[PDB]
């Protein structure tokens, strides 16, 4: 890689509000960027215990750790050392909407992610405010190039306590801070699991596997 | 299969309007339902030549022909001989919206699809009314069970003449006419290509490969 | 008016499907186009009794009968004798979507409206399929000019049996068949009431008052 | 009013990001709450000069100053001294989305508004990032009660330099911190004008007239 080692670490500084409730989070992560393997530990440093499902924040806590085949240009890795930013819109089926923005920078062997999260209109008796969600189903992000940016769309779904799903549509725009070689139409399959946490989720550990690929049936 | 042979044929009767323009279509198709392989020939029997891109109609012309692994229940095949119906909403990025409804019945070795298509708000100088589209990128439909129905979401994209993409979000609801064994969270990867057509697309031939699968990274 | 008399009549021919259920409707209407007063009688000539709330069809049954102040150009009236068409998208809060297209022509003292209605994804246990709706709250359509077309947006709401509202967002695009003088940013306030009907709504009578105006607080 | 004087003042503390760009704003306002008349002066205290149109922030800078007829219960005024909060979603026609949350408190004769603004996906060559907008057309918010909250929908539009409009749909949810008497289906007409500002809009003065009313044609 030259700029990105086979083994990297990263820090996460997140801030934001959910239905008006302010909060702050810090995380320490590590993983093999070229293997698409990752793990991170979060701490609600302010505003905890959170009155909403942690699952809505788990996806906001690292694109550089995506396994890209050699024949598919890696938009995000190419952006360093300059780095990139991403902007995300999350539309939940019960009307809740979230806007999230990240700034990813690099320093030596450590990535630094600054995140601003804004979510609202989560129904008081809904899955999020009642904490009835149980993790995200594995997902598949559809990605393509446009205006020098990489745009990703994903039909996410949170498993519900008692069965059923709580749908959320994701739209993420990755913006490199310098022009890079754009990839073709492809996908990134992911698995995001909370592997550990304390009773009130003021402490959480997450694992994620991200692998890019070309259309299965082409 | 018992009800669905290894080799089947099917007839398509489509009717509808696009920005007020009425039209009728008839098709003769054939394929191997258990192999997910298909081919169909369409004829614009009324209202032709069509003043809009044929690509918006190609996806409306056959779920029974989807290759499902044995460990994933095939919602659509299970529905026969009773059959099923599907309702679809297509949201294009330039504001155009389409609502499509199908009724799939079976008689011996032949499937019969009756289709009603309603599309409007296609900008006069847009890709559809100017016929600047060049086929659909291969897609991946996210499917899950709910209320006894199978619901599918797909981020489709039409290739544009001169480069670039014209996005369309698909939402399809499959309704069996009798209760069947519901599948888990899965996907269906597809490839839909117009393999032949005359000058004004009043005649068209399409090929499609549909394969179901479980999450890649799980 | 010269082309539009002070008292006019009109015929309505509607066809369409709701969750796959086909139907046909015919109506005889009359009103004072310059006073914005209207009344029409509908008959479900085919596919009745309808298994869904009639309220979703009441708004599809006459823009020429809108009272426009003299200082606000009347886009629709100006279009005659050539006439115009309108395309409408209806988004209900429970996910149901409808696409509607009309063609308005004139012959002497009578207007003729041909309508195609396509609605689907109405939840089986929802307000529409269970017939729990009780009319539309009076509405206010926001209108402005663009590309020679008049575009209207309206936040509609159906009153529910037992209290509460069932929201629906309307987007209507009016397309004159000949260039006309475009109006500025304005609104059209309406009142649409079912004044009579038989037991299964296979027969219905509707009254409507439509008045254009400039912003109240400007 | 007892709690709200005929003449009041208020302070505004806003913070947020637009396409990743952080900023802070402070304002001093005054007005006659029962007359629906208002005026406020803003200062970009941090992150200026802003690289985006100020118009997107003008609507985030005071519901208490709305003239409500006596026969229509004033949800917001009733909430004091406890106060209320509002959550807003802004959907622009070019894809940009904003989520805004406010907290309105009262102390004597002064209202205090704390605001968090999150906006993103504003196209770099769009009206907002290029500063081609010229104020909001007067608007009309559709309001109704639900779950003890007041919900408002508004079809907003920004005038564009060179003619034309840039559409934005508003959805605002007002949440009183204590139960109050809920109003019926009604509207609030508004006029929001930037009456003064310096060259780079790091200083701005805004005027607003807000009047509630029942449906015009009922």
Structure tokens at A2: 């030259």
Are D30 and D12 in contact by the 8 Å Cβ rule? The answer is no
**C109 in contact with chain B, both atoms CB, cutoff 8 A:** no
**B195 in contact with chain C, both atoms CB, cutoff 8 A:** no
In 10 A of CB C137, how many CB atoms? 20
Interface contacts (A, B; CB < 8 Å) = 71
Neighbors of chain A with 3 or more C-beta pairs under 8 Å: B, D
In 10 A of CB A71, how many CB atoms? 8
The dihedral formed by the CA atoms of D6, D11, D15 and D18, expressed in degrees to the nearest 10: 50
Kindly tell me the number of DSSP H helices and DSSP E strands found in chain A. Answer: 1, 12
Question: Can you give the length of chain D in residues?
Answer: 218
Q: Do A216 and B215 touch (CB under 8 A)?
A: no
- Pick from A99, A123, A173: CB nearest D99: A99
Paired strand residues for C37: C32, C209
Residue B108's contacts (CB-CB under 8 Å, 6 or more residues apart) are none
The domain containing residue C132 runs over which residues?
1-218
Angle at A94 between CA B122 and CA A53, to 5 degrees: 135
Distance, in Å, from the CA atom of C7 to the CA atom of C64, rounded to the nearest integer, reads 11
- Pick from B187, B191, B217: CB nearest A211: B217
Distance, in Å, from the CA atom of A82 to the CA atom of A91, rounded to the nearest integer, reads 30
Q: Phi and psi dihedrals of C58, rounded to 5?
A: -55, -40
Residue with tokens 């622009």: D92
Angle at A117 between CA A113 and CA A119, to 5 degrees: 160
In 10 A of CB C187, how many CB atoms? 25
**A17 in contact with chain D, both atoms CB, cutoff 8 A:** yes
Residue with tokens 């079912």: C194
Distance, in Å, from the CA atom of B120 to the CA atom of B118, rounded to the nearest integer, reads 7
Q: Do A99 and D103 touch (CB under 8 A)?
A: no
Structure tokens at C57: 């069809």
β-pairing, A203-213 vs A186-197, is antiparallel
Residues of A within 8 A of D147 (CB-CB) are 123-124
**Resolution for this PDB entry, in angstroms:** 2.4
Interface contacts (A, D; CB < 8 Å) = 59
CATH number, domain with residue B153: 2.40.155.10
Burial of D179 (0-12, 13-18, 19+ CB in 10 A): exposed
Residue A19's contacts (CB-CB under 8 Å, 6 or more residues apart) are A52, A119, A120, A121, A122, A129, D87, D101
Structure tokens at B56: 């918006």
Cα of A191 to nearest chain B Cα, Å: 6
Q: Is D69 helix (H, G, I), strand (E, B) or coil?
A: coil
Using only C-alpha atoms, chain B has a radius of gyration, in whole angstroms, of: 17
Q: Do B140 and A138 touch (CB under 8 A)?
A: no
Are D28 and D129 in contact by the 8 Å Cβ rule? The answer is no
Residues of C within 8 A of B173 (CB-CB) are 120-121
Residue C78: in which H helix or E strand, if any?
helix C75-78
Are C173 and B95 in contact by the 8 Å Cβ rule? The answer is no
Q: Do D124 and A116 touch (CB under 8 A)?
A: no
Are C213 and C187 in contact by the 8 Å Cβ rule? The answer is yes
C142, C169, C184: best to mutate for the D interface, most D CBs within 10 A: C142
Angle at A31 between CA A30 and CA A32, to 5 degrees: 150
Q: Do C87 and B120 touch (CB under 8 A)?
A: yes
Kindly tell me the number of DSSP H helices and DSSP E strands found in chain D. Answer: 1, 12
Distance, in Å, from the CA atom of B74 to the CA atom of B59, rounded to the nearest integer, reads 20
Cα of C101 to nearest chain B Cα, Å: 6
Residue C164: in which H helix or E strand, if any?
none
Residue D206's contacts (CB-CB under 8 Å, 6 or more residues apart) are D39, D40, D41, D42, D58, D61, D192, D193, D194, D195
Residues of B within 8 A of A160 (CB-CB) are none
**A108 in contact with chain D, both atoms CB, cutoff 8 A:** no
Residue with tokens 């599918």: B152
**D150 in contact with chain A, both atoms CB, cutoff 8 A:** no
**D137 in contact with chain C, both atoms CB, cutoff 8 A:** yes
Residue with tokens 């981020």: B155
**Selection from D98, D165, D107, D172 nearest residue D132 by Cα:** D165
Structure tokens at C150: 């008049």
Are D42 and D202 in contact by the 8 Å Cβ rule? The answer is no
**Selection from A100, A105, A140, A110 nearest residue A30 by Cα:** A110
**D119 in contact with chain A, both atoms CB, cutoff 8 A:** yes
CA distances in angstroms from D38 to B38, D8, D57, D62, D201, listed in the order given? 66, 9, 16, 9, 20
Hey, which residues 66-105 in chain B have their CB within 8 Å of chain C?
A: 85, 87-89, 97-99, 101, 103
The dihedral formed by the CA atoms of B154, B155, B160 and B165, expressed in degrees to the nearest 10: -170
Residues of A within 8 A of B38 (CB-CB) are none
Q: Is C169 helix (H, G, I), strand (E, B) or coil?
A: strand
**C138 in contact with chain D, both atoms CB, cutoff 8 A:** yes
Q: Do D217 and C137 touch (CB under 8 A)?
A: no
Tell me which chain B residue has its CA closest to the CA of residue A209: B217
C92, C216, C218: best to mutate for the D interface, most D CBs within 10 A: C216
Burial of C196 (0-12, 13-18, 19+ CB in 10 A): exposed
Kindly tell me the number of DSSP H helices and DSSP E strands found in chain B. Answer: 1, 12
DSSP annotation of A181 reads P
Q: Do C215 and D142 touch (CB under 8 A)?
A: no
Residue with tokens 């799980």: B218
Instruction: Return the exposure string of B177-207: e unless at least 16 CB atoms fall within 10 Å of the residue's CB, then b.
Output: eeebebbebbbbbbbbebeeeeeebbebbbe
Tell me which chain C residue has its CA closest to the CA of residue D170: C155
Contacts 24+ apart (CB under 8 A), B201-204: B201/B44, B201/B49, B201/B50, B201/B54, B202/B43, B202/B44, B202/B48, B202/B49, B202/B50, B203/B41, B203/B42, B203/B43, B203/B44, B204/B41, B204/B42, B204/B54, B204/B58
Tell me which chain D residue has its CA closest to the CA of residue C187: D140
Residue A117: which region, alpha, beta or left (left: phi > 0; alpha: psi -120 to 50)? beta
Structure tokens at B29: 């198709």
What is the total count of domains within chain A? 1
Q: Do A120 and D98 touch (CB under 8 A)?
A: no
**B20 in contact with chain C, both atoms CB, cutoff 8 A:** yes
Residue with tokens 């900023």: D23
Cα of B217 to nearest chain C Cα, Å: 30
Burial of C181 (0-12, 13-18, 19+ CB in 10 A): exposed
**B119 in contact with chain C, both atoms CB, cutoff 8 A:** yes
The 3-state secondary structure of D122-152, one letter per residue: CCCCCCCCCCCEEEECCEEEEEEEECCEEEE
**D131 in contact with chain A, both atoms CB, cutoff 8 A:** no
Distance, in Å, from the CA atom of A189 to the CA atom of A165, rounded to the nearest integer, reads 19
**C185 in contact with chain D, both atoms CB, cutoff 8 A:** yes
Residue D67's contacts (CB-CB under 8 Å, 6 or more residues apart) are D34, D35, D36, D37, D210, D211, D212
Residues of B within 8 A of C101 (CB-CB) are 17, 19-20, 118, 120
In chain D, helix, strand, coil percent, each to 5?
A: 5, 55, 40
Using only C-alpha atoms, chain A has a radius of gyration, in whole angstroms, of: 17
β-pairing, B110-120 vs B8-18, is parallel
Q: Is D75 helix (H, G, I), strand (E, B) or coil?
A: helix
B69, B136, B142, B150: best to mutate for the A interface, most A CBs within 10 A: B142
Residues of D within 8 A of A171 (CB-CB) are 121
Q: Do B165 and A185 touch (CB under 8 A)?
A: yes
Q: Do C215 and D189 touch (CB under 8 A)?
A: yes
Using only C-alpha atoms, chain C has a radius of gyration, in whole angstroms, of: 17
Question: Can you give the length of chain B in residues?
Answer: 218
**Selection from D10, D23, D208, D7 nearest residue D113 by Cα:** D10
Structure tokens at B93: 């990025």
């Amino acid at each position: 890689g030259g700029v990105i080692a086979t083994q990297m670490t990263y820090k996460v500084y997140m801030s934001g509000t959910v239905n008006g409730h302010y909060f702050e989070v810090e995380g320490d992560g590590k993983g093999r960027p070229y293997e698409g393997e990752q793990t991170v530990k979060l701490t609600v440093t302010k505003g905890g215990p959170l009155p909403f499902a942690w699952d809505i924040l788990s996806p906001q806590c690292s694109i550089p750790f995506t396994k890209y085949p050699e024949d598919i240009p890696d938009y995000v890795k190419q952006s360093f050392p300059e780095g990139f930013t991403w902007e995300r819109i999350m539309n939940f089926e019960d009307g809740a909407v979230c806007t999230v923005s990240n700034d990813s920078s690099i320093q030596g062997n450590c990535f630094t992610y600054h995140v601003k999260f804004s979510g609202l209109n989560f129904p008081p008796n809904g899955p999020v405010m009642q904490k009835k969600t149980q993790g995200w189903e594995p997902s598949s992000e559809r990605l393509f190039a446009r205006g020098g940016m990489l745009i990703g769309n994903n039909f996410m779904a949170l498993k519900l306590e008692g069965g059923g799903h709580y749908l959320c549509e994701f739209k993420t725009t990755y913006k490199a801070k310098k022009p890079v070689k754009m990839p073709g139409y492809h996908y990134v399959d992911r698995k995001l699991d909370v592997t550990n946490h304390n009773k009130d989720y003021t402490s959480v550990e997450q694992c994620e596997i991200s692998i890019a690929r070309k259309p299965v049936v082409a």
